[PDB]
Design a protein around this ligand. Structure first.
Ligand SMILES: Nc1ncnc2c1ncn2[C@@H]1O[C@H](COP(=O)(O)OP(=O)(O)O)[C@@H](O)[C@H]1O
Ligand SMILES: [Zn+2]
Ligand SMILES: [Zn+2]
Lengths: 59, 245, 76, 474, 73
């Protein structure tokens, strides 16, 4: 389904946008994955985010 | 003036002190008045004043228990001050002495203390000793905790918590801290040095404020081991009554 | 006589009327101060369906008395 | 204070502090001595013995036993000190008033009021050990909310603490009922205004305290159904991935700091709130098993001075920067490498949060032992804030629920239909009843030996008016 | 005129509607404003689900009052 990274509260806050900006994080004048570094994802008190792309076990 | 002479009271009550009429007039005291009596080692207690003309002027009568609590002997001097702001003890938590309760059957509190404090209004302070003579036995106790602190009057409605384990007697004796200058001899010079270097900065700070100097802080005692350095330091600290650490 | 009346929501008001006076008078007072037709006003106390055709005497209600108000339509 | 501080805390802490927890041991085959006298192997085992725990599969040391360890380690009796308080909570806020000669922090700082480096290390004492649910319905209905709607949920849980024999000097939090605040739940998350939620929870907490309960944690569901025909959910939370993302840890730390545990052995008198947080995600299989966690004391004191924020990587928490009114020193998280050597790695960019957690063990009471449930309920009157679903508390619901039994009798049936949490809260909100009338209502509903109290309730005028209005209402 | 309505999301909205129009008009106003059809919405006040056949006057809804919204297809 869409709840694997692209749903509600993942489009209100550009989580994919945050990840991509962290990737190309330079002045300089889509896919979401865990190949890189974290970028500060700050939300106000009283908001919980469960929309992180799942990872599943070792299988 | 208020340096009442110590004497052995005829009565055994733990909250009664008999004074001469002349002294009563001098200090404006009266019979039944609760006053704060201070003896030696800064020990303090609250006693009910009773007029008694047999005593010579300037002399007061206190019992053995009060003298032991104040750590003073017969013929000493005790300072008496008004104690008008003493409230009634909301709750007094007290436990007996183990040795004094050996062989006692039934509820100790009802047998001994229940008639002692009811309709008595005896002022009690923490750390004091009171003895009750019930039937054929005499039992000493300790004022472990008093609410309000540090002392208060045990009224009829005051709740007395006697629940708890017995208190061993050996603790008071074999742990004989609060040792005064009377336990140290032959080192008067060094004792005087330590006194003048410790007490005055603490007991009378205003002296150095008036003169306008910063009193010295550190002090280093040294000498052969076993000469009582620790004893001297403990004695000075206890005499000063400061927060020894 | 001083009395308390609480509506369905919880709003509380204080009214005055004679005990022997018919409760119809108090119902009319409440109506005129809130425009509530007499039928639309139902007064309850101790589970009793109070009605205009009586007074506070028969209900053993005196000063400092609290009653509840409800609309007979379908509930609150 | 010349001795132990004077302050009153829960009864559980008092009774625990009364005991000693010494674990007796018998003559080992390695002893060489007579019957009396004990050498090194026959001595009683202290309650905090690390070997005993790890040998019994217990991961943390039952905080009270930690207090016993700290008291034994120091504080010699009758001499040697004047009772330096053993416990003290961490505090990382820079002292704005130090003044060796320097000015306040914004324009001056000496080496005495400079927050030294912070060394994160996994905690060893868990304040609350076993979280226990009186009846499975409590969480079954909570999950049923998501089942019907599909969106996530979140709710505080009320209950009380008690002893727990299975762990040396251990504690269990027994949860009696769950209360749901007004939240704007969604598919990937939820949102709830903090101010309004706390305003409502203040009065809900007052009423619960009147009932004898207390707020002892928050439980939320992280559930997403799989494509299987029957009920199966993906296991997103396990050793491979994160257990609790950074945001959840932050929220748990805030809540813990806002419910301090009053204790007698600290300078401030409080330490390491007892506030368990539980999460539902599903084990490796399709089950919907729950879990429990509790953020360590440092994270509790690390987030009061900000210094942590969520990160796009679920298992790592981002670190903020220095600025006026907020000084953040270097953070080292100390692990142990496979060769049994402690290693300090500087983590300014981001560090895992598994060093900011301690795990608990959920469970349910034995289904054939004594039942001391306060509420025989959780299947009836709709719960509070389920407006989104068809659930809606109102007069007609009460008429349909508790009118036939009320109008006839069946005092056993009336009692079993009157000891429901949400029903009591709703009728209290009705305000139809007087203060002492509601007090006797709760004493009849949430207590044993309830015959005369229920009889008094029914005999009252308020109940008569309530049933009358219920009858009047359709 | 001035009324308050507790929404489903958990917030309160202030709506302007005269007390001399059918509650159906209020339902139309809310549903148009937020796009949730009124064919399923139900109103609640004093535990009295408001039947659509009557206006505000019948309930004498006072100004700056408050109602609740629920959903049921
Ligand atoms: N007036 C005194 N002068 C010296 N020693 C004394 C005196 N009175 C008692 N003592 C004894 O001398 C010893 C003093 O011990 P001390 O040297 O102070 O110990 P520490 O090694 O800790 O300094 C104790 O046994 C004490 O009882
Ligand atoms: Zn041995
Ligand atoms: Zn400084």
């Amino acid at each position: 389904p869409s709840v694997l990274g692209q749903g509600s509260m993942s489009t209100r806050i550009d989580y994919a946008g945050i990840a991509n900006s962290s990737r190309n994080k330079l002045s300089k004048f889509m896919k979401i994955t865990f190949d890189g570094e974290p970028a500060k994802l700050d939300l106000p008190e009283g908001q919980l985010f469960f929309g992180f792309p799942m990872v599943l076990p070792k299988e | 003036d208020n340096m009442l002479l110590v004497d052995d009271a005829i009565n055994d009550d733990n909250s009664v002190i008999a004074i001469n009429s002349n002294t009563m007039d001098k200090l404006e005291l009266f019979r039944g008045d609760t006053v704060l009596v201070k003896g030696k080692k800064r020990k303090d207690t609250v006693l009910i004043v009773l007029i008694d003309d047999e005593l010579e002027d300037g002399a007061c009568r206190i019992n053995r228990v009060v003298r032991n609590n104040l750590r003073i002997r017969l013929g000493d001097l005790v300072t008496i001050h008004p104690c008008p702001d003493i409230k009634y003890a909301t709750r007094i938590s007290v436990l007996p002495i183990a040795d004094t309760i050996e062989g006692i059957t039934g509820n100790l509190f009802d047998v001994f203390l229940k008639p002692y404090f009811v309709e008595a209004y005896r002022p009690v302070r923490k750390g004091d000793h009171f003895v009750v003579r019930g039937g054929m036995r005499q039992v000493e106790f300790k004022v472990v905790d008093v609410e309000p602190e540090e002392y208060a009057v045990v009224a009829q409605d005051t709740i007395i918590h006697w629940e708890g384990e017995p208190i061993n007697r050996e603790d008071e004796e074999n742990n004989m801290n609060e040792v005064g200058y009377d336990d140290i001899g032959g080192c008067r010079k060094q004792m005087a040095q330590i006194r003048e270097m410790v007490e005055l900065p603490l007991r009378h700070p205003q002296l150095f404020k008036a003169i306008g100097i910063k009193p010295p802080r550190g002090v280093l005692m040294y000498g052969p081991p076993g000469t009582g350095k620790t004893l001297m330091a403990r004695a000075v600290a206890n005499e000063t009554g400061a927060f020894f650490f | 006589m001083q009395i308390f009346v609480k509506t369905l929501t919880g709003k509380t008001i204080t009214l005055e009327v004679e005990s022997s006076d018919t409760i119809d008078n108090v119902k009319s007072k409440i109506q005129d101060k809130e425009g509530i037709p007499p039928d639309q006003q139902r007064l309850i106390f101790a589970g009793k369906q109070l009605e205009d055709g009586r007074t506070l005497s028969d209900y053993n209600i005196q000063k400092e008395s609290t009653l509840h108000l409800v609309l007979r339509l379908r509930g609150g | 204070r010349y001795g132990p501080l004077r302050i009153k805390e829960l009864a559980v802490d008092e009774e625990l502090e009364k005991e000693d927890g010494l674990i007796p041991r018998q003559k080992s085959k390695l002893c060489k001595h007579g019957d009396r006298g004990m050498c090194e192997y026959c001595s009683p085992l202290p309650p905090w013995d690390k070997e005993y725990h790890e040998k019994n599969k217990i991961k943390h040391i039952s905080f009270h036993s930690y207090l016993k360890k700290l008291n034994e380690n120091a504080n010699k009796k009758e001499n040697g000190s004047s009772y330096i308080s053993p416990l003290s909570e961490p505090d990382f806020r820079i002292n704005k008033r130090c003044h060796n000669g320097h000015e306040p922090w914004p324009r001056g700082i000496c080496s005495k009021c400079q927050p030294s480096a912070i060394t994160l290390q996994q905690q060893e004492f868990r304040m609350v050990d076993h979280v226990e649910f009186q009846k499975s319905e409590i969480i079954n209905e909570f999950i049923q909310a998501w089942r019907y709607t599909g969106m996530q949920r979140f709710g505080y849980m009320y209950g009380s603490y008690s002893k727990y024999d299975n762990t040396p000097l251990g504690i269990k939090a027994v949860v009696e009922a769950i209360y749901e605040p007004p939240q704007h739940d969604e598919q990937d998350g939820l949102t709830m205004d903090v101010e309004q939620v706390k305003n409502e929870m203040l009065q809900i907490d007052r009423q619960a305290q009147e009932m004898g309960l207390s707020r002892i944690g928050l439980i939320f569901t992280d559930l997403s159904d799989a494509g299987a025909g029957d009920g199966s959910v993906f296991c997103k939370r396990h050793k491979d991935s994160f257990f609790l993302s950074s945001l959840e840890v932050i929220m748990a730390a805030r809540h813990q700091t806002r419910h301090p545990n009053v204790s007698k052995y600290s300078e401030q008198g409080f330490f390491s709130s007892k506030f368990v947080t539980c999460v539902i995600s599903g084990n490796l299989e399709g089950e919907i098993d729950i879990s429990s966690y509790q953020v360590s004391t440092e994270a509790e004191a690390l987030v009061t001075a900000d210094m942590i924020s969520g990160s796009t990587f679920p298992s790592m928490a981002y670190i903020n920067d220095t600025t006026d009114e907020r000084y953040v020193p270097e953070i080292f998280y100390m692990k142990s490498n496979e060769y049994g050597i402690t290693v300090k790695e500087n983590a300014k960019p981001a560090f895992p949060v598994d060093y900011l957690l301690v795990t608990l063990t959920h469970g349910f009471p034995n289904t054939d032992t004594e039942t001391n449930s306060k509420f025989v309920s959780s299947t009836g009157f709709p719960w509070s804030n389920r407006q989104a679903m068809g659930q809606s508390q109102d007069y007609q619901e009460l008429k349909k629920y508790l009118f036939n039994v009320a109008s006839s009798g069946d005092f056993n049936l009336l009692h079993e239909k009157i000891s429901n949490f949400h029903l009591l809260l709703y009728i209290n909100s009705l305000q139809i009843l007087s203060p002492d009338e509601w007090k006797l209502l709760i004493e009849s509903a949430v207590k044993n030996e309830w015959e005369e109290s229920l009889l008094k309730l029914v005999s009252s005028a308020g109940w008569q008016t309530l049933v009358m209005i219920l009858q009047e209402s359709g």
